[PDB]
Design an enzyme around this catalytic site. Structure first.
Site, mmCIF file in Angstrom:
data_model
loop_
_atom_site.group_PDB
_atom_site.id
_atom_site.type_symbol
_atom_site.label_atom_id
_atom_site.label_comp_id
_atom_site.label_asym_id
_atom_site.label_seq_id
_atom_site.Cartn_x
_atom_site.Cartn_y
_atom_site.Cartn_z
ATOM 1 N N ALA A 181 -0.685 -9.788 3.287
ATOM 2 C CA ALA A 181 0.248 -10.418 4.208
ATOM 3 C C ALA A 181 -0.108 -10.189 5.669
ATOM 4 O O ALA A 181 0.621 -10.661 6.548
ATOM 5 C CB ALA A 181 1.674 -9.915 3.940
ATOM 6 N N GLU A 225 5.236 -3.877 13.621
ATOM 7 C CA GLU A 225 6.041 -3.239 12.589
ATOM 8 C C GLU A 225 7.533 -3.188 12.914
ATOM 9 O O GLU A 225 8.332 -3.246 11.964
ATOM 10 C CB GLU A 225 5.517 -1.828 12.292
ATOM 11 C CG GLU A 225 4.142 -1.835 11.653
ATOM 12 C CD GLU A 225 3.749 -0.497 11.075
ATOM 13 O OE1 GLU A 225 2.664 0.009 11.432
ATOM 14 O OE2 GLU A 225 4.522 0.047 10.260
ATOM 15 N N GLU A 239 26.051 6.763 -9.938
ATOM 16 C CA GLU A 239 26.604 7.966 -9.329
ATOM 17 C C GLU A 239 26.020 8.229 -7.947
ATOM 18 O O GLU A 239 26.673 8.880 -7.125
ATOM 19 C CB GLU A 239 26.374 9.167 -10.251
ATOM 20 C CG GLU A 239 27.290 10.344 -9.972
ATOM 21 C CD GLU A 239 27.366 11.317 -11.132
ATOM 22 O OE1 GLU A 239 27.004 10.923 -12.265
ATOM 23 O OE2 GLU A 239 27.789 12.475 -10.910
ATOM 24 N N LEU A 295 22.179 5.918 -11.826
ATOM 25 C CA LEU A 295 22.044 5.337 -10.493
ATOM 26 C C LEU A 295 23.394 5.030 -9.859
ATOM 27 O O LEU A 295 23.543 5.140 -8.636
ATOM 28 C CB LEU A 295 21.196 4.066 -10.560
ATOM 29 C CG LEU A 295 19.771 4.203 -11.097
ATOM 30 C CD1 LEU A 295 19.101 2.837 -11.184
ATOM 31 C CD2 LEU A 295 18.956 5.145 -10.226
ATOM 32 N N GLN A 333 0.823 -1.206 0.000
ATOM 33 C CA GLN A 333 0.000 0.000 0.000
ATOM 34 C C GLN A 333 0.859 1.259 0.000
ATOM 35 O O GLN A 333 0.647 2.170 -0.808
ATOM 36 C CB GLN A 333 -0.942 0.001 1.201
ATOM 37 C CG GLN A 333 -1.668 1.326 1.373
ATOM 38 C CD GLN A 333 -2.725 1.285 2.451
ATOM 39 O OE1 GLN A 333 -2.783 2.162 3.315
ATOM 40 N NE2 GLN A 333 -3.579 0.270 2.404
ATOM 41 N N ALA A 334 1.826 1.337 0.916
ATOM 42 C CA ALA A 334 2.668 2.526 0.990
ATOM 43 C C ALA A 334 3.375 2.773 -0.336
ATOM 44 O O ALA A 334 3.317 3.877 -0.890
ATOM 45 C CB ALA A 334 3.680 2.386 2.128
ATOM 46 N N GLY A 386 3.247 -6.114 5.730
ATOM 47 C CA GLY A 386 3.692 -7.465 5.432
ATOM 48 C C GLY A 386 4.185 -7.616 4.005
ATOM 49 O O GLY A 386 5.132 -8.363 3.742
HETATM 50 N N1 LIG Z 1 3.742 7.743 4.023
HETATM 51 C C1 LIG Z 1 2.865 6.765 3.808
HETATM 52 N N2 LIG Z 1 2.863 5.669 4.640
HETATM 53 C C2 LIG Z 1 1.984 4.663 4.444
HETATM 54 C C3 LIG Z 1 1.069 4.716 3.404
HETATM 55 N N3 LIG Z 1 0.328 3.587 3.452
HETATM 56 C C4 LIG Z 1 0.755 2.829 4.488
HETATM 57 N N4 LIG Z 1 1.774 3.490 5.119
HETATM 58 C C5 LIG Z 1 2.548 3.024 6.280
HETATM 59 O O1 LIG Z 1 2.957 1.699 6.002
HETATM 60 C C6 LIG Z 1 2.848 0.882 7.152
HETATM 61 C C7 LIG Z 1 1.860 -0.248 6.883
HETATM 62 O O2 LIG Z 1 2.302 -1.035 5.802
HETATM 63 P P1 LIG Z 1 1.505 -1.134 4.406
HETATM 64 O O3 LIG Z 1 2.333 -0.652 3.237
HETATM 65 O O4 LIG Z 1 0.201 -0.381 4.474
HETATM 66 O O5 LIG Z 1 1.214 -2.716 4.308
HETATM 67 P P2 LIG Z 1 1.437 -3.548 2.954
HETATM 68 O O6 LIG Z 1 2.780 -3.278 2.329
HETATM 69 O O7 LIG Z 1 0.324 -3.220 1.994
HETATM 70 O O8 LIG Z 1 1.411 -5.097 3.393
HETATM 71 P P3 LIG Z 1 0.112 -5.881 3.952
HETATM 72 O O9 LIG Z 1 0.394 -6.333 5.363
HETATM 73 O O10 LIG Z 1 -0.107 -7.085 3.073
HETATM 74 O O11 LIG Z 1 -1.101 -4.977 3.921
HETATM 75 C C8 LIG Z 1 2.363 1.777 8.275
HETATM 76 O O12 LIG Z 1 3.490 2.230 8.993
HETATM 77 C C9 LIG Z 1 1.710 2.930 7.544
HETATM 78 O O13 LIG Z 1 1.742 4.107 8.314
HETATM 79 C C10 LIG Z 1 1.060 5.818 2.556
HETATM 80 O O14 LIG Z 1 0.256 5.880 1.626
HETATM 81 N N5 LIG Z 1 1.963 6.841 2.766
HETATM 82 MG MG LIG Z 2 -1.643 -3.977 2.305
#
Ligand SMILES: Nc1nc2c(ncn2[C@@H]2O[C@H](COP(=O)(O)OP(=O)(O)OP(=O)(O)O)[C@@H](O)[C@H]2O)c(=O)[nH]1
Ligand SMILES: [Mg+2]
Ligand SMILES: Nc1ncnc2c1ncn2[C@@H]1O[C@H](COP(=O)(O)OP(=O)(O)CP(=O)(O)O)[C@@H](O)[C@H]1O
Ligand SMILES: Nc1nc2c(ncn2[C@@H]2O[C@H](COP(=O)(O)OP(=O)(O)O)[C@@H](O)[C@H]2O)c(=O)[nH]1
Ligand SMILES: [Ca+2]
Ligand SMILES: [Ca+2]
Ligand SMILES: [Ca+2]
Ligand SMILES: [Mg+2]
Ligand SMILES: [Mg+2]
Lengths: 426, 54, 438, 350
Positions: free
Chosen positions: C99, C183, C254, C252, C11-12, C144
């Site tokens: 995950a 985390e 550099e 990259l 997601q992030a 995850g």
């Molecule tokens: N800056 C920022 N942080 C995010 C965002 N989405 C999630 N996070 C951070 O990412 C962490 C959660 O991990 P995620 O990336 O949402 O989980 P995932 O990679 O999708 O893995 P799963 O467990 O399968 O859902 C937390 O610390 C959130 O605050 C985003 O859009 N922007």
């Molecule tokens: Mg996710």
């Protein structure tokens, strides 16, 4: 689509389950005939978690009604939302279970379990991606307790990698039907320790005291108790039924709330709890302080007697999300002695824009507290007061059980109590 | 405070100022790790089913 | 011209990737439909922007990007968003169940069954490259997927593309917007297995981005949209040298040569300025000295730490807008006589400066105001070791009781991998301390 | 309700502050490893500054300035004075000092001998003192051979400093002494000097023809109470306070403590603390710092004040604990965490 399959078994489990579907159906804009008449798109964005979509835009609860006698499920089928359930999803016998765990688990229940699993298999086969199951039942009776835990065992065997979740009503001598309830509850608890991922502990004595002392209901009825459970079940499932970040699915919630596999028994709470001064606007501070007050919790365990391993709070309504964090942080920082320090940031808060019916805002509390051991200690003491004299055992040996299985259930629950104690002083 | 490697183009320029001088696992080993973890899951699940069969 | 492939995991990574490509398009004049009126070479060319965008015969400029998520809800927004026309389905990969914030689930259980599909989609983009430089991987530490699957992908990328560089943009977990208690476990597990496969990683601490959004943008409760718009400005500043004409950080390789003399210590600190609220009616434009001086303010750093109590191994100044070398050198001299800037004795005390005349692009309707000049400083300072210490401490607190460990072992991970990963971090913290403290 | 933790059980000062904090009923003491605190009374060594200011919603304050060790270490202080332009090597209030590393390990051995030989040829007094931070281990000698050889037998960094051969002697007694000043720097970097100092006097007549016996040369409280026979004769515990000392300077020198000594002490405190302010200030930092310092001064027969060293973890005179500790709560802790005079400190402006 992360679908959840709901199962309700026995008298208590079907009456609480019926009210639950009544409450959330109103929240999602579903009328007693499955027709949607809401006015917000947030009502449908995650509707498939609990409802199947049939022809004509009809939404049918993904629920399975189980019982060993017809009476209660007749009442459901004629009740308010009785017509909303799938007719084929009513599975029931005729002999009853006589408040006997062995009848539900070994004899009467064994004859009916396969047909119930046929319906479960049918519902699961039509899920795009099944999350897991939630079961509503009591532990003091025979069907919900004995057959309910039989169903969990056979469901886990067929779906070993799915989450199993239950709402379990714990018996209390103050709100009791029969004297064998501690027998039935001790036998069920061992099943739950081994085959559920999350179990919401609901104590009938706490429900009664809340109805009497707080809600000022002179003479509580099972119906009054069930409305508290409806509201509580709606609160804990908000994260699953509406868009959100925290505890989005059953497995993610289990990973945030269960640091050890056996210690998965939660204390739920709700706010507000007001008697009929019912129109007064509640403030975020008031919501928070009441949500963490013991009088607002439904396991009859004093949190100040133990420590929280993890906490999940859910705030509903249009409110200051900034002011929500401030009060939550104030509660943790003002009572840090009750939170274990070896799990950093173990208090998670989630917000939901849609409030329950008839309230501008509310908060639901889910605690994994070592104080829950007080609940198992009561059951264990009541179990032993009778078992040391073998009182009422003949109801169970007459169904094929022997005393050894009781002795093991007794030891299993005392082990659980000992496990909670070691983390209360860590 | 020396400027070196000054480069200029239509969209910018770059340079370096110096204030003071100074004084893997193979594709095979990765499959074993993944398969080994899959075996531990299968073993644990078999014990669970064996437990339920009893 | 040499191509760069971007990979967004979890997601992030996906939501940050969406915000970056939005900004990339506005910076290059690419419309949501992929057309670029300023590109006079239809369906071809080897310009600087071609490192991030391929071209179709119809003149569509397609990002060299892949999105991966073990759950489809976040990536369905890309398929239905403003820039949906930008990508084709081969680029967007989604599973059905995620995950669950479980590194072992993303890395082993689910990763094993989807890794070959992701490599196959990346191979397709690689086949479009005449001289692929490497990859930019966006992901979170806490999730995850971002933790577990990323580390598996990096391991395979080192096998399939041995000579290619790999850079990270990693989101460091912050409880103010974190959704999981485990985390710290995931962050340490993914750093342990990714450390030897990443040539250079830029960590963004959500706590820092969060407070900048409240302090500088007057946002009481920032959303991921707010955080991602700001992060994409820093990412853009870092990648601009690859997408525009220039002579600093042109490829990259550099990045490693200029920021990472010690291979394991490959986590440069990013500091950005100015961040001005768009709602701010009257605003006074900051000078070159003022924005340069701000690069040494802890409050503007992507990771809150005190560089005054560390040593620098490298320092890079990346300016955008109305800036001339004369004013940069004057500001630098002033800051030395006032700031605590201590380099390691085996590194020259200097600064590499890049100036791009085009000022920062702002997303219409965004939170950031248009400024005449801006800077991003990349400094490899031992002070960032404070972040590893904070994270390893939380790890140690939970792991002493084996709290939550069963979730990982249940997915087939050995408990010994926890201590293995933790000991690697303890050695990383030791490396920083040997280079920084006397 | 404010929260704090105690991580230095050996601090007599912050044991009284903790006792006072709890007396207000508005402060609660948490376990020493609880991260949810407002105030940390931290350990002396290896204080984890990197973990402060990362708890959402908690304004956290610590009783130590990260980086103040540069001032409170023997060798560090010397280097800071020679290298810092606002102090310069020509600093007129710090005795000529040199950083000397034992030969078994930059080093200032040659520079020291150059200044030493220059004094030996010039008939000038050439008495130096060798000391270090790892001491309870001090040597005073007029021969450079004995000093260097003494440091080589050790294994830690030392500093050779010019010995003040003309100290001011209190009469009667003809005895040496030093002055301890307590200075509190709050989160805003205000420099408060406690209005109460203490003279740690030697109960032995100052003898300039015998540095072997260090009982009349070292004014430490533990040395006078262990190797001195006249401990407590002239004043209780070899501690003379500003009231008695000021009256003395007037009767014997026709001057005051403020004019003759205090102006130089306030100048020295401000110079040292202003010098490192950019390096240790917590103004724009994610956490806040304050710290109590103990400055040690010497006074010669010309009424010139010299800085001997700075102590980062000082104690207090038994009589002044209640007042000072209370003052610490008023200006350092309550300023950031207010509760629901005639200040005892002298604010040094800057
Ligand atoms: N800056 C920022 N942080 C995010 C965002 N989405 C999630 N996070 C951070 O990412 C962490 C959660 O991990 P995620 O990336 O949402 O989980 P995932 O990679 O999708 O893995 P799963 O467990 O399968 O859902 C937390 O610390 C959130 O605050 C985003 O859009 N922007
Ligand atoms: Mg996710
Ligand atoms: N340059 C000098 N000339 C004369 N006497 C000196 C001197 N330096 C130190 N002394 C004497 O030595 C004594 C202690 O010196 P120093 O302060 O270095 O040791 P120390 O740090 O163990 C005592 P404290 O507890 O105050 O830190 C002082 O009381 C002073 O009288
Ligand atoms: N809260 C609540 N508890 C109930 C209700 N009905 C029965 N119980 C409790 O459930 C236990 C009896 O189990 P019951 O469900 O009636 O037996 P079953 O039909 O065999 O499963 C006793 O402890 C009762 O107090 C109800 O409607 N609400
Ligand atoms: Ca029968
Ligand atoms: Ca072109
Ligand atoms: Ca490699
Ligand atoms: Mg009944
Ligand atoms: Mg000392």
């Amino acid at each position: 689509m992360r679908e959840i399959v709901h199962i309700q078994a026995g008298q208590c489990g079907n009456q609480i389950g019926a009210k639950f579907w009544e409450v959330i159906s109103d929240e999602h804009g579903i009328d007693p005939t499955g027709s949607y008449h809401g006015d917000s798109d947030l009502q449908l964005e995650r509707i498939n978690v609990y409802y199947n979509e049939a022809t004509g835009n009809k939404y049918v609860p993904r629920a399975i009604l189980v019982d060993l006698e017809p009476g209660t499920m007749d009442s459901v089928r004629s009740g308010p939302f009785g017509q909303i359930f799938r007719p084929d999803n009513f599975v029931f016998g005729q002999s009853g279970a006589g408040n006997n765990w062995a009848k539900g688990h070994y004899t009467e229940g064994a004859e009916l379990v396969d047909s119930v699993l046929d319906v479960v298999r049918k519902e699961s086969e039509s899920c795009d991606c099944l999350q897991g199951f939630q079961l509503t039942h009591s532990l003091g009776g025979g069907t919900g307790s004995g057959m309910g835990t039989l169903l969990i065992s056979k469901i886990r065997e067929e779906y070993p990698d799915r989450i199993m979740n239950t709402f379990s009503v714990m018996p209390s001598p103050k709100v009791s039907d029969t004297v064998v309830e501690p027998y039935n509850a001790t036998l069920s608890v061992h099943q739950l320790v081994e085959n559920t991922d999350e179990t919401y502990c609901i104590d009938n004595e706490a429900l009664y005291d809340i109805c009497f002392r707080t809600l000022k209901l002179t003479t509580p009825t099972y119906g009054d108790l069930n409305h508290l459970v409806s509201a509580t079940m709606s609160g804990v499932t908000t994260c699953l039924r509406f868009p959100g970040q925290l505890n989005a699915d059953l497995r993610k919630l289990a990973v945030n709330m269960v640091p050890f596999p056996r210690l998965h028994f939660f204390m739920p709470g709700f706010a507000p709890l007001t008697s009929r001064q019912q129109y007064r606007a509640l403030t975020v501070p008031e919501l928070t302080q009441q949500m963490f007050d013991s009088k607002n919790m439904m396991a009859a365990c004093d949190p100040r007697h133990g420590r929280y391993l993890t906490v999940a709070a859910i705030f509903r309504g249009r409110m200051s999300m900034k002011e929500v964090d401030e009060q939550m942080l104030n509660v943790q920082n003002k009572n840090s002695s009750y939170f274990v320090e070896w799990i950093p940031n173990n208090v998670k808060t989630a917000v939901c824009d849609i409030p329950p019916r008839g309230l501008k805002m509310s908060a639901t509390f889910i605690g994994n507290s070592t104080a829950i051991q007080e609940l198992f200690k009561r059951i264990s003491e009541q179990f032993t007061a009778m078992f040391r004299r073998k009182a009422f055992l003949h109801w169970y040996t007459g169904e094929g059980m022997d005393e050894m299985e009781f002795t093991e259930a007794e030891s299993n629950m005392n082990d659980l109590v000992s496990e909670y104690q070691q983390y209360q002083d860590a | 405070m020396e400027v070196i490697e000054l480069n200029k183009c239509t969209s910018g320029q770059s340079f370096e100022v110096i204030l003071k001088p100074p004084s893997d696992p193979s594709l095979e080993e990765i499959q074993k790790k993944l398969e080994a973890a899959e075996e531990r899951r299968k073993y644990q699940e078999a014990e669970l089913l064996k437990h339920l069969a009893e | 011209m040499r191509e760069c492939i971007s990979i967004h995991v979890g997601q992030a990574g996906v939501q940050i990737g969406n915000a970056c490509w939005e900004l990339y398009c506005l910076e290059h004049g690419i419309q949501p439909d992929g057309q670029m009126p300023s590109d006079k070479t239809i369906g071809g060319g080897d310009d600087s922007f071609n490192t991030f965008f391929s071209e179709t015969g119809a003149g569509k400029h397609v990002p060299r990007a892949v999105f991966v998520d073990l759950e489809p809800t976040v990536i369905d927004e890309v398929r239905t968003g403003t820039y949906r026309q930008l990508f084709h389905p081969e680029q967007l990969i989604t599973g059905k169940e995620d995950a669950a914030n479980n590194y072992a689930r993303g890395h082993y259980t689910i990763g094993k069954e989807i890794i070959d599909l992701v490599l196959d989609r990346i191979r397709k983009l690689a086949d479009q490259c005449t001289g692929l430089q490497g990859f930019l991987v966006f992901h979170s530490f806490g999730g995850g997927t971002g933790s577990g699957f990323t580390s598996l992908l990096m391991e395979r990328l080192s096998v399939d593309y041995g000579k290619k560089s790999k850079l990270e943009f990693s989101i460091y977990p912050a409880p103010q917007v974190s959704t999981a208690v485990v985390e710290p476990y995931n962050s340490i597990l993914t750093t342990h297995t990714t450390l030897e496969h990443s040539d250079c990683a830029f960590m963004v601490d959500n706590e820092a981005i969060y407070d900048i959004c409240r302090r500088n943008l007057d946002i009481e409760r920032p959303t991921y949209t707010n955080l991602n718009r700001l992060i994409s400005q820093i990412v853009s500043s870092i990648t601009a040298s690859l997408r525009f004409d220039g002579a600093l950080n042109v490829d990259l390789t550099e990045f490693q040569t200029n920021l990472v003399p010690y291979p394991r210590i490959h986590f440069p600190l990013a500091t950005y300025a100015p961040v001005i609220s768009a709602e701010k009616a009257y605003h006074e434009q900051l000078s070159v000295a003022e924005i340069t001086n701000a690069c040494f303010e802890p409050a503007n750093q992507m990771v809150k730490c005190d560089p005054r109590h560390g040593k620098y191994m490298a320092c890079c100044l990346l300016y955008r807008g109305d800036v001339v070398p004369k004013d940069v050198n004057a500001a630098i001299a002033t800051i030395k006589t006032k700031r605590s800037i201590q380099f390691v004795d085996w590194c020259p005390t200097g600064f590499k400066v890049g100036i791009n005349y085009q000022p920062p692009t702002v997303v219409p309707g965004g939170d950031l105001a248009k400024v005449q000049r801006a800077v991003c400083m990349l400094s490899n300072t031992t002070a960032i070791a404070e972040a590893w210490a904070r994270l390893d401490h939380k790890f140690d607190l939970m792991y002493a009781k084996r709290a939550f460990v069963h979730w990982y072992v249940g997915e087939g991970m050995e408990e010994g991998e926890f201590s293995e990963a933790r000991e690697d971090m303890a050695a990383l913290e030791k490396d920083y301390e040997e280079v920084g403290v006397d | 309700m404010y929260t704090f933790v105690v991580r230095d059980e050996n601090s007599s000062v912050y044991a009284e502050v903790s006792r006072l904090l709890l007396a207000t009923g508005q402060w609660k003491r948490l376990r020493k490893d609880n991260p949810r605190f407002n105030l940390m009374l931290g350990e002396r060594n290896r204080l984890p500054f990197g973990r402060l200011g990362h708890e959402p919603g908690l304004v956290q304050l610590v009783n130590y300035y990260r980086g103040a060790d540069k001032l409170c270490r023997k060798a560090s202080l010397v280097k800071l004075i020679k290298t810092s332009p606002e102090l310069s090597e020509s600093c007129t209030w710090f005795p000529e000092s040199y950083v000397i590393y034992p030969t078994n390990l930059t080093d200032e051995r040659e520079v020291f001998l150059a200044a030493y030989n220059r004094r030996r040829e010039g008939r000038e007094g050439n008495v130096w003192i060798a000391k270090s931070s790892a001491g309870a281990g001090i040597l005073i000698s007029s021969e450079a051979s004995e000093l260097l050889d003494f440091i080589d037998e050790q294994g830690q960094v030392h500093v050779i400093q010019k010995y003040l051969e003309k100290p001011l002697l209190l009469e009667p007694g003809h005895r040496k002494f030093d002055i301890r000043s307590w200075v509190l720097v709050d989160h805003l970097y205000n420099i408060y000097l406690y209005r109460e100092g203490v003279l740690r006097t030697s109960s032995e007549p100052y003898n300039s023809a015998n540095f072997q016996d260090k009982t009349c040369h070292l004014t430490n409280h533990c040395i006078q109470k262990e190797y001195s026979k006249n401990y407590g004769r002239y004043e209780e515990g070899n501690e003379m306070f500003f009231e008695e000392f000021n009256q003395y300077l007037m009767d014997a020198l026709n001057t005051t403590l403020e004019n003759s000594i205090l102006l130089q002490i306030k100048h020295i405190i401000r110079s040292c603390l202003m010098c490192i302010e950019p390096a240790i200030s917590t103004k724009h930092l994610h956490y806040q710092s304050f710290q109590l310092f103990g400055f040690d001064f010497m006074v010669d027969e010309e009424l010139k004040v010299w800085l001997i060293e700075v102590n980062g973890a000082p104690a207090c005179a038994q009589k002044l604990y209640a007042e000072l500790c209370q003052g610490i709560v008023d200006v350092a802790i309550s300023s950031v965490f207010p509760l629901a005079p005639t200040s005892i400190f002298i604010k040094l402006h800057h």
